[PDB]
């Protein structure tokens, strides 16, 4: 069966999980207490789809998830809030000190002990599964647990399972805004784990989502709930092809197969087109061409890098709702006509297309308008290099003077490892700059004669 | 631009000589003629060829095409071309029992040795004669067969489990896991030919008890390298010698069966048709450029229609030298078979009867 | 009696098969439950070409459904005609190839190939005199292309004498969904050239252009494309089920179309098509039928035959019509279009006539062209393939499944040789100067 | 007795047989169920003449025929149609694949098996016969069964029986029109069987009959039923002399004796004069001179060859109806007067004449007008060479490039046999060009 396991690590992961599981419960008709009234109303169907929920004897539906954190505050907020009866009591909390915004504590000293419990719970959930497709890991670069413990967990998962997919929905640090001082060290030290082990990593930036909320939804003072709601919409759009039928359904394996040319360059950008307020929902048609055009605007990207500075290596569009292949094909043709969007010459086709009949849902108390059509775009492009390069600069400005290094060194981490990360980091950028080069020299060719 | 056609008529065997048999084939110049024995009054059927060889009885001291004679006409030229670095190929065509195998192998008494033994003896002579310190000669011999478009090795003692045939873009067609063995004297090659011809795929039909159900190709890989006290070291002298034994043609009139027998017959006939078309098409462009020197495009000669022509591409196309010899039975009974053999030989630079 | 076994692979194959079986069931007056409720006695005369009998006077299609994602099988089963197929013929697995031709040819498809061949054998031994098989599959996909080629290979090894046709949907230059279409198309055309007696080529833009331009439909979906393809498939095998003045089994078309074994790729077409609202203005006569049939814009493969020469054509008519008019119109279309037919066939128009037209029409016709212009379909693909191979765009996904670059190069060379083959029959006429 | 056996082979043969047996059933008063009401009305005579029908005890009349085909469609249509109760259930059908317009399949691979059943039924019918005169064979060049299986059947028939006559009513490919691509191969490959074995072979072309229907019988969109009806009329005219009395009755033996100067040139042309529509039946006299003149017109020939380009080696006229020898002789004299008709110098007489009293009948739903007089001409002439020559050209255009050859070679036929056929074909043409030369 099309089964997934969602691992939430860190405060950002836990809050993203809150928003995500709110959306899934609303999508599938599950009440906060786990019971589905619609089972006895319809009397058939698997609307409590196995992709995210496991059904027990009494009709209760337990989500397939594992929260993790090294601070009891946030997970206890989950454990006392509205959804306290939904989740299994195994929330895997370390009732001890935090990683304290230190990669070393989350990876080497404090990250131990809890790792065994986390792996045991993941093993149990995998055993309960039959046809596991992959893991979804939510975390945040720049945090303590979200960086180090996520790296350790990914290493152990890659060792244990090997072939199963592992996607990442991670929060990269922003160019200007930042809520920590030692953020670049933590962000850089995860390059090895997010490069070697993860199969496909999606980057989201809080500044980009703030800009989207300010411009599109017309919210002057957003908070993290809106950001988590948008990210949850994107995850639901990605995973919808597994759950609901459609004219063209894209499994995770197809999505990866079409998005990643080479095994080191798996960093696509996620965007959602019909992000519009209810008041502005009127005066608009929101046809297929409109949402496809909106997907390509640099203003609506979720990470602060302009694709116009780079080349579109690959694209995957996932439509939901009242959509027909004709308009999708026409929109793709119109996109290919424009010369502002550049494509590498070693990818003549350029696109992947999926269509799902189930339209998106509106969370009560949210801000997104009810719509009949939507699309989620995953674009693998070279412009992501920009988002890396800026952060690299900051790292140098700290590592030249060895600022804050003693905190990492005292916690059982060798100093030279710092430099190693940068080397890996640098190599990755070079790799991206290699795949933008528009064709080989092809110096060898011959001439012709006449007879 | 070298395709020649040869025909050789066999003499009456012991059974035919003892029985009341008659001769119906005449020779003169380049023209071979055959007359229907029951209706010879209608017209003689005649064909012209580049090479022609006569035989009707055993001794035939004077004006007779001995084995050494056919070797000099066809074999010696191809061996010289192989020595000069050009790929070469010799086909032996004819119905079962026509005597093509006699030409290809010959008698082991060493009084009348076929083309293959004389060729290999001269090769071993040339190499040992021209063997010096700098010139390094190396020879490796392989032997294979096609049965129902499937390749089988004959030299290796391993199981006869059907193999695949592929093509390197630079090195041309090849066969996966085909054994090739080095040889240094006539004894080794003779042992290899015995071990090979003992393992051929044959079946009993209504025509002959050991009629070949498979085409057989004996390949010799010959290379000559120069390694002097210097740095500009190249080889520039590599050749392949192909010796092809074809299964005789058959009709549904004689093959009174359905299924495996008819399938084998149809596959075999398709292989001969492909080979005939390949050689005729090559011969047309042999005629053309040799006198025009006009490059009328590649005019690619199809070799995929069948597998037999595909593996023989390196020895068929390019600067290769190919020839074919057809076995003809002058006895009274084999008029229809013989005439079909003449028709098959007529192509590949067909020459009109002047 | 000539009886056909039908095989379907992939989402495209399954959907075309569903629509085609609906069309045939309505043609033979079969209810969705399998019971017969027709009026004419000719419908049961040769219903056994496609159907088998079951004890309670029931008819079961002789179809075999293949896939690796259960979603399509569930869609087919829970439908208007889902109950008509026998459940044992639904063959599927899990975790499909996903547009990876290696997975559906080596890793995954090797698991289900044995089960599908067991079902095929059971279907064939129940057939008193098998005529040939029939495969419907998408060429640019995953499980479809790969497992269809594997099934073609195994069936050709098992049943060399029987005919094997293929209604294949091949990639588009413009209307392209999957990014790795060229690899699958190349590695499949490597196999189609060797192990099939016929291969009808279909393109999505041809069907869309027919829908927008002729049928004047405003919102064509995959249902309409499946409808057109099903109409063609019904037209091809019409003479094996109904009487006529000139009959044409699948073999006679194979004999009269392909001059050489490798040139067995066809361009299908159907007529009439008149927009459902303009049929009142145009009369249904053989001249109009054949004029629409030979029109360049009607072809279902997105190739202009005016860029090449017709090696052969076959026209199969349905309905009561005069033989003299058909012969005269064929002579007319051959003579006027003197430059679009090769000369080394003096008369290269095969003709067949069947008495029973479609249910709601006076007369119709279907067309199978064999032209050199089809080479374009490969050349474009080859171009894209090279553009994605010389840099190794998505190569590792294939090589992790147990392949190597040599197979890619072999497939590319095979397709190029096919293209040159077809190219040699569009200029070489008859002369000594060249 | 004057007893004939009619063998119908192929789809064209079966449909021609349908039309023919409709005609004879109407001629002799046989109902579709085999019973004759007139037997109890008249109480005498052999109106169910033995030349085509065998009478059983219960008064049923079974035709002397054998249909053959390698596809169950057309013979099943016969077996379910109106005349299902007429024929014996032995229709000799191979419930297997067709010959697929391929000579090799019809002769070598698929042609066997069914050949034994066909020969057994033919032997049974011959044993039931007493005074068998010859076989009539209907088929078509260019088809699969009609060519290959016909050749095999005639080879076996010539072996078994030998001295009995064997006629062909075969359909030759047209110059321009054609419903097959590999038609010339199949048509040429039967030159050996239609030359060595057949005693006399009549050639009919669909283009010529289409021209006749569109011009004489004022029909614009004819179908194969009209063609079969015309061929049936010709066969009835040929065979009438065996069944009905006449002033001069021309058996098959004397007809052959007069039409074939040498044993290799037995390819006459068949024509029928009063082909006219009932609307045009008025305003016309249709005397003997008119129909005799109309037979010689090149427009009314049934194969696209102009006799004016050649010489009339022989002619055999068979009249039906209100005809008297005086007008026949006058018409023959008038024909001999004209210089547009050339006769070879070594045939001073030139004509055979037969006269029969029974007039032709009109099929209900047909298109021929009822008439009091008619004539069928069988003219042996050199112009038939033209009809061969065109075909040879087409064959060459295929065989230079070996188009479609693999289909024949794969089915157990040696390739060189192709060439042999053409050689025989060429020789045949030469023979005709030899006999048109004036003596010296
Ligand atoms: C005169 C009349 O009654 O109306 C026609 C009609 O208006 C037209 C426009 C029909 C109509 O077809 C379409 O509108 C159409 C739309 C998309 C794709 C294909 C067709 C018709 O729907 C289609 C329908 O066709 C049939 O029933 C044929 O037998 C056809 N049947 C099916 O395809 C079929 C569909 C669903 C379920 C079962 C069968 C068929 C064709 C070939 C071989 C076998 C069967 C007919 C008569 C008509 C309508 C109803 C309007 C046409 O269809 C055909 C193939 O006959 C479209 O152009 C033709 C010509 C007709 O004039
Ligand atoms: N978009 C979004 N970002 C969040 C959210 N919660 C925390 N973050 C980000 O997380 C980063 C801070 O690091 P954390 O993820 O909280 O680290 P941690 O999981 O608490 O682990 P410790 O550092 O040991 O406390 C900042 O960049 C925040 O912007 C959230 O709900 N939504
Ligand atoms: N005059 C006339 N010709 C016919 C008739 N039916 C078929 N033909 C001709 O027959 C030729 C085709 O050969 P067929 O007789 O159909 O061959 P077959 O007997 O069906 O045997 P197969 O080739 O195996 O199908 C065409 O040239 C047709 O014009 C008919 O009823 N009347
Ligand atoms: N004609 C037609 N083509 C289709 C249909 N569905 C998908 N396709 C085409 O098939 C291709 C995808 O192949 P797919 O069906 O996924 O192959 P599979 O993975 O083996 O099932 C796309 O390029 C589509 O254009 C259909 O219903 N009809
Ligand atoms: N000078 C000669 N020319 C041609 N044939 C000859 C000559 N001397 C002997 N032969 C014949 O060569 C034949 C060899 O046949 P063989 O190799 O047994 O055929 P197969 O291998 O097909 O069984 C013998 O039948 C023999 O009569
Ligand atoms: Mg916490
Ligand atoms: Mg039939």
> For residue C409, how many other CB atoms are within 10 A of its CB?
14
Where does a domain end: C259, C292, C314?
Answer: C259
Element (H, E) at D66: strand D65-68
CATH 1.10.287.600 domain locations along chain D: 384-440
Strands of D76-199, DSSP E: 132-140, 165-172
- CATH value at residue C341: 3.30.1330.20
Measured from the alpha carbon of residue A11, the closest ligand is 2
> Beta strands C310-318 and C349-354: pairing type?
parallel
Q: Are C100 and A257 in contact (CB under 8 A)?
A: yes
Asked if residue B275 is part of any domain, the answer here is yes
CA distances to B296, C290, D173, D223 from C332, rounded to whole Å, are 35, 10, 18, 19
- State in Å: Cα A11 to ligand 2 middle: 5
Ion ligand 7 neighbours, Cβ < 5 Å? D 69, 71, 73-74
Cross-chain Cβ contact C417/B300 below 8 Å: yes
How many angstroms separate the CA atoms of C137 and C139, rounded?
A: 6
CA distance C66 to chain D (A): 29
Nearest chain C Cα to D390, which residue? C346
Element (H, E) at C156: helix C143-158
- State in Å: Cα D418 to ligand 3 middle: 22
| Residue D206 labeled ligand binder | yes
Residue among B11, B113, B125, B121 nearest B70 (CA):
B113
Cross-chain Cβ contact B249/D414 below 8 Å: yes
> Beta strands C364-371 and D61-63: pairing type?
unpaired
> For residue B59, how many other CB atoms are within 10 A of its CB?
7
How many angstroms separate the CA atoms of A437 and A418, rounded?
A: 30
Q: Which residue has the tokens 């040879």?
A: D392
Which residues on chain B are in Cβ contact (under 8 Å) with A451? 293-295
CATH placement of domain D269-383:
3.30.1330.20
3-state secondary structure B245-307: ECCCCCCCCCCCCCCHHHHHHHHHHHHHHHHHHHHHHHHHHHHHHHHHCCCCCCCCCCCCCCH
Q: Are B255 and B205 in contact (CB under 8 A)?
A: yes
Question: CB-based contacts of B279: which residues, under 8 Å, 6+ apart?
Answer: B3, B316, B322, B324, B347, B348
* Residue D63 phi, psi dihedral angles, 5° rounding: -70, 155
Which residues on chain A are in Cβ contact (under 8 Å) with C392? 262
- CATH value at residue C388: 1.10.287.600
CA within 13 Å, CB half, D96: 14
Exposed / middle / buried, residue C407 (Cβ in 10 Å: 0-12, 13-18, 19+): middle
> Which protein residue has the closest C-alpha to ligand 1 atom 16?
C224
Same domain? For C25 and C126 the reply is: yes
Q: Are A13 and A154 in contact (CB under 8 A)?
A: no
Q: Are D308 and D269 in contact (CB under 8 A)?
A: no
Asked if residue B353 is part of any domain, the answer here is no
How many angstroms separate the CA atoms of B280 and B300, rounded?
A: 13
Which one of the listed residues D254, D290, D417, D429 is annotated catalytic? D254
CA distance B163 to chain C (A): 15
How many angstroms separate the CA atoms of C404 and C87, rounded?
A: 39
Q: Are C60 and C86 in contact (CB under 8 A)?
A: yes
**Axis crossing angle, helix C70-77 with helix C10-27, rounded to the nearest 10:** 20
| Domain at D384-440, CATH class | mainly alpha
Asked whether at least 3 C-beta pairs link C and D within 8 Å, the reply is yes
How many angstroms separate the CA atoms of D132 and D51, rounded?
A: 9
End-to-end CA distance of chain D: 46
For an interface test with B, the pick among D413, D414, D420 (most B C-beta atoms closer than 10 Å) comes out as D414
> For residue D188, how many other CB atoms are within 10 A of its CB?
26
> For residue D293, how many other CB atoms are within 10 A of its CB?
15
**Dihedral (Cα; A209, A213, A215, A217), 10-degree rounding:** 150
Pocket flag, ligand 1, residue C288 (CB < 6 Å): no
Tokens of B92: 């032996």
> For residue D269, how many other CB atoms are within 10 A of its CB?
24
DSSP type of residue A309: G
CA distances to A300, D64, D399 from D174, rounded to whole Å, are 73, 31, 19
Nearest chain A Cα to C385, which residue? A348
Question: CB-based contacts of A229: which residues, under 8 Å, 6+ apart?
Answer: A19, A23, A363, A366, A367, A368
Asked if residue B127 is part of any domain, the answer here is yes
Cross-chain Cβ contact C180/A257 below 8 Å: yes
How many angstroms separate the CA atoms of D161 and A289, rounded?
A: 83
Which residues on chain C are in Cβ contact (under 8 Å) with B166? 406, 410
Same domain? For C275 and C333 the reply is: yes
Q: Are A350 and A311 in contact (CB under 8 A)?
A: no
Resolution in A: 3.0
Question: CB-based contacts of A311: which residues, under 8 Å, 6+ apart?
Answer: A342, A343, A344, A381, A382, A436, A438
**Dihedral (Cα; C340, C342, C346, C349), 10-degree rounding:** -60
Where does a domain end: C233, C259, C285?
Answer: C259
Write out the residue range of the structural domain in which residue C215 sits. 2-259
Which residues on chain A are in Cβ contact (under 8 Å) with B295? 451
> Which protein residue has the closest C-alpha to ligand 4 atom 2?
C12
Residues recorded for chain B: 354
> Which protein residue has the closest C-alpha to ligand 4 atom 24?
C177
Same domain? For C277 and C239 the reply is: no
- State in Å: Cα D223 to ligand 3 middle: 13
Strands of D241-308, DSSP E: 269-272
How many angstroms separate the CA atoms of D190 and A276, rounded?
A: 81
Asked if residue B354 is part of any domain, the answer here is no
Where does a domain end: C259, C285, C317?
Answer: C259
The fold adopted by the segment(s) D1-268 is: Rossmann fold (3.40.50)
Exposed / middle / buried, residue A173 (Cβ in 10 Å: 0-12, 13-18, 19+): buried
Positive or negative, the CA dihedral C137, C141, C146, C147 is negative
How many angstroms separate the CA atoms of C83 and C87, rounded?
A: 8
Q: Which of B258, B277, B340 sits opposite D414 (nearest CB)?
A: B340
Residues recorded for chain D: 440
Q: Which residues pair with B238 in a beta bridge?
A: B223
Positive or negative, the CA dihedral C73, C75, C77, C82 is negative
Q: How many domains does chain C have?
A: 3
CA distance B342 to chain C (A): 25
* Widest distance between CA atoms in chain D: 68
CA distances to B134, B226, B229, D107 from B232, rounded to whole Å, are 13, 10, 9, 67
Tokens of A383: 């412009």
Tokens of C163: 């005919």
How many angstroms separate the CA atoms of A270 and A238, rounded?
A: 10
**Axis crossing angle, helix D288-295 with helix D325-337, rounded to the nearest 10:** 40
> Which protein residue has the closest C-alpha to ligand 5 atom 11?
B99
Angle (CA) A183 A185 A186, round 5°: 65
| Residue C38 labeled ligand binder | no
> For residue D420, how many other CB atoms are within 10 A of its CB?
15
Residue among C310, C301, C318 nearest C240 (CA):
C318
- State in Å: Cα C72 to ligand 4 middle: 11
CATH 3.40.50.1440 domain locations along chain A: 1-268
Same domain? For C268 and C247 the reply is: no
- CATH value at residue B114: 3.40.850.10
| Residue D41 labeled ligand binder | no
Measured from the alpha carbon of residue A97, the closest ligand is 2
> Which protein residue has the closest C-alpha to ligand 1 atom 8?
C276
What SS3 class is residue C13? helix
Measured from the alpha carbon of residue D9, the closest ligand is 3
CA distance B348 to chain D (A): 14
Q: Are A48 and A55 in contact (CB under 8 A)?
A: yes
Write out the residue range of the structural domain in which residue B295 sits. 3-346
Which residues on chain B are in Cβ contact (under 8 Å) with D406? 270, 273
* Residue A254 annotated to the active site: yes
Nearest chain D Cα to B343, which residue? D416
> Which protein residue has the closest C-alpha to ligand 1 atom 43?
C231
How many angstroms separate the CA atoms of D372 and D177, rounded?
A: 35
Element (H, E) at D358: none
Q: Which residues pair with B298 in a beta bridge?
A: none
- State in Å: Cα C216 to ligand 1 middle: 14
| Domain at A384-441, CATH class | mainly alpha
For an interface test with B, the pick among D412, D427, D428 (most B C-beta atoms closer than 10 Å) comes out as D412
Residue among D238, D231, D159, D163 nearest D193 (CA):
D159
């Amino acid at each position: 069966m099309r089964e997934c396991i969602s691992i939430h690590v860190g405060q950002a992961g836990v809050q993203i999980g809150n928003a995500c599981w709110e959306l899934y419960c609303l999508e599938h008709g599950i009440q906060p207490d786990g019971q589905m009234p619609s089972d006895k109303t319809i009397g058939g169907g698997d609307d409590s789809f196995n992709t995210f929920f496991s059904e027990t004897g009494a009709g209760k539906h337990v989500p397939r998830a594992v929260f993790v954190d090294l601070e009891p505050t946030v997970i206890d907020e989950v454990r006392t809030g509205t959804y306290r009866q939904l989740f299994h009591p195994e929330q895997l909390i370390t009732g001890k000190e935090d990683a304290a915004n230190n990669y070393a504590r989350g990876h080497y000293t404090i990250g131990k002990e809890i790792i065994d419990l986390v792996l045991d719970r993941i093993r149990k959930l995998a055993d309960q599964c039959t046809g596991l497709q992959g893991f979804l890991v939510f975390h945040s670069f720049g945090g303590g647990t979200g960086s180090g413990f996520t790296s350790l967990l990914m290493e152990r998962l890659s060792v244990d399972y090997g072939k199963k997919s592992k996607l990442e929905f991670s929060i990269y640090p922003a160019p200007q805004v930042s809520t920590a001082v030692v953020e670049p060290y933590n962000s850089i030290l995860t390059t090895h784990t997010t490069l070697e082990h993860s199969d496909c990593a999606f980057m989201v930036d809080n500044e980009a989502i703030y800009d989207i909320c300010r411009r599109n939804l017309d919210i002057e003072r957003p908070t993290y709930t809106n950001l988590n709601r948008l990210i949850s919409q994107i995850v639901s759009s990605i995973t919808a092809s597994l759950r609901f039928d459609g004219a063209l359904n894209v499994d995770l394996t197809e999505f990866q197969t079409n998005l990643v040319p080479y095994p080191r360059i798996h960093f696509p950008l996620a965007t959602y087109a019909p992000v519009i307020s209810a008041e502005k929902a009127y005066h608009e048609q929101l046809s297929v061409a409109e949402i496809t055009n909106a997907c390509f605007e640099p203003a609506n990207q979720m990470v602060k890098c302009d694709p116009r500075h780079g080349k579109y290596m690959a694209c995957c569009l996932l439509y939901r709702g009242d959509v027909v292949p004709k308009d999708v094909n026409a929109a793709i043709a119109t996109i290919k006509t424009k010369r502002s969007i550049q494509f590498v010459d070693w990818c003549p086709t350029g696109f992947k297309v999926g269509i799902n009949y189930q339209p998106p849902t509106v969370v009560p108390g949210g801000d997104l308008a009810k719509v009949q059509r939507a699309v989620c775009m995953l674009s693998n492009t070279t412009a992501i290099a920009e988002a890396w390069a800026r952060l690299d600069h900051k790292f140098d400005l700290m590592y030249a003077k060895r600022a804050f290094v003693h905190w990492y060194v005292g916690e059982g981490m060798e100093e030279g490892e710092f430099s190693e990360a940068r080397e890996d980091m640098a190599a990755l950028e070079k790799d991206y700059e290699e795949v933008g080069v528009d064709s080989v020299e092809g110096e060898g060719e011959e001439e012709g004669e006449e007879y | 631009a070298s395709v020649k056609v040869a025909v050789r008529v066999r003499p009456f065997n012991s059974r035919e000589m003892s029985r009341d048999s008659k001769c119906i084939i005449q020779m003169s110049g380049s023209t071979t003629t055959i007359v229907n024995p029951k209706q010879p009054k209608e017209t003689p059927k005649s064909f012209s060829f580049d090479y022609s060889y006569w035989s009707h009885t055993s001794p035939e001291d004077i004006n007779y095409a001995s084995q050494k004679q056919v070797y000099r006409d066809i074999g010696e030229e191809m061996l010289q071309h192989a020595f000069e670095g050009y790929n070469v190929c010799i086909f032996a065509y004819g119905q079962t029992g026509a005597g093509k195998s006699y030409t290809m192998m010959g008698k082991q008494e060493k009084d009348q040795q076929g083309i293959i033994p004389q060729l290999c003896e001269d090769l071993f002579s040339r190499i040992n004669d021209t063997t010096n310190d700098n010139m390094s000669y190396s020879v490796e011999v392989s032997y294979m067969e096609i049965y129902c478009e499937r390749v089988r090795d004959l030299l290796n003692p391993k199981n006869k489990g059907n193999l695949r045939v592929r093509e390197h873009p630079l090195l041309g067609p090849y066969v996966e896991d085909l054994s090739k063995l080095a040889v240094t004297s006539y004894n080794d090659i003779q042992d290899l030919m015995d071990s090979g011809n003992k393992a051929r795929t044959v079946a009993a039909t209504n025509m002959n008890e050991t009629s070949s159900r498979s085409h057989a190709v004996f390949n010799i890989i010959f290379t000559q390298k120069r390694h002097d006290a210097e740095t500009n070291i190249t080889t520039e002298k590599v050749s392949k010698i192909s010796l092809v034994d074809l299964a005789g043609s058959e009709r549904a009139d004689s093959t009174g069966a359905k299924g495996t027998r008819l399938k084998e017959g149809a596959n075999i006939n398709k292989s001969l048709t492909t080979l005939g078309k390949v050689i005729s098409a090559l011969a047309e462009m042999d005629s053309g450029p040799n006198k025009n020197k006009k490059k009328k495009k590649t005019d690619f000669i199809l070799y995929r229609d069948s597998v037999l022509t595909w593996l023989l591409r390196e020895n068929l196309g390019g600067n290769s030298r190919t020839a074919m010899v057809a076995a003809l039975s002058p006895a009274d009974i084999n008029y229809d078979e013989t005439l079909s053999t003449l028709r098959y030989a007529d192509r590949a630079k067909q020459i009109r009867c002047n | 009696m000539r009886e056909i076994v039908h095989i379907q692979a992939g989402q495209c194959g399954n959907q075309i098969g569903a629509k085609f079986w609906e069309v045939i069931s309505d043609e033979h007056g079969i209810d969705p439950t399998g019971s017969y409720h027709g009026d004419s006695d000719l419908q049961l005369e040769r219903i056994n070409v496609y159907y088998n009998e079951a004890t309670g006077n029931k008819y079961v299609p002789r179809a075999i459904l293949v896939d690796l994602e259960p979603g399509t099988m569930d869609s087919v089963r829970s439908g208007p005609f889902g109950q008509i197929f026998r459940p044992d013929n639904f063959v599927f697995g899990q975790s499909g190839a996903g547009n990876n031709w290696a997975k559906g040819h080596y890793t995954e498809g090797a698991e289900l190939v044995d089960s599908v061949l067991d079902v095929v054998r059971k279907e064939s031994e129940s057939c008193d005199c098998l005529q040939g098989f029939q495969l419907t599959h998408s060429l640019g996909g995953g499980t479809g292309s790969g497992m269809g080629t594997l099934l073609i290979s195994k069936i050709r090894e098992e049943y060399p004498d029987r005919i094997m046709n293929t209604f294949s949907v091949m990639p588009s230059p413009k209307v392209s969904d999957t990014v790795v279409e060229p690899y699958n198309a190349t590695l499949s055309v490597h196999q189609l050239v060797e192990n099939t007696d016929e291969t009808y080529c279909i393109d999505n833009e041809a069907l869309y252009d027919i829908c927008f331009r002729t049928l004047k439909l405003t919102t064509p979906t995959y249902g309409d494309l499946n409808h057109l393809v099903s109409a063609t498939m019904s037209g091809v095998t019409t003479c094996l089920r109904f009487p006529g003045q000139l009959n044409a089994d699948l073999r006679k078309l194979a004999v009269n179309m392909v001059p050489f074994p490798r040139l067995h790729f066809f361009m299908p077409g159907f007529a009439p098509l008149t927009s459902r609202g303009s049929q009142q203005y145009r009369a249904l006569t053989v001249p109009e039928l054949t004029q629409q049939m030979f029109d360049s814009k009607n072809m279902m493969a997105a190739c202009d035959p005016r860029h090449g020469r017709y090696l052969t054509v076959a026209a199969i008519f349905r309905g009561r019509m005069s033989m003299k008019e058909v012969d005269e119109q064929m002579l007319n279309v051959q003579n006027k279009n003197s430059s679009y037919f090769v000369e080394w066939i003096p008369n290269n128009v095969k003709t067949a006539v069947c008495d029973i037209p479609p249910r709601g029409l006076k007369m119709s016709a279907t067309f199978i062209g064999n032209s050199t212009a089809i080479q374009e379909l490969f050349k474009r693909i080859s171009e894209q393939f090279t553009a994605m191979f010389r840099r190794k765009a998505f190569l590792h996904w294939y090589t992790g499944e147990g392949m190597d670059e040599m197979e890619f190069t072999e497939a590319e060379s095979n397709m190029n040789d096919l293209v040159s083959e077809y190219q040699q029959y569009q200029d070489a006429t008859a002369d000594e100067q060249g």
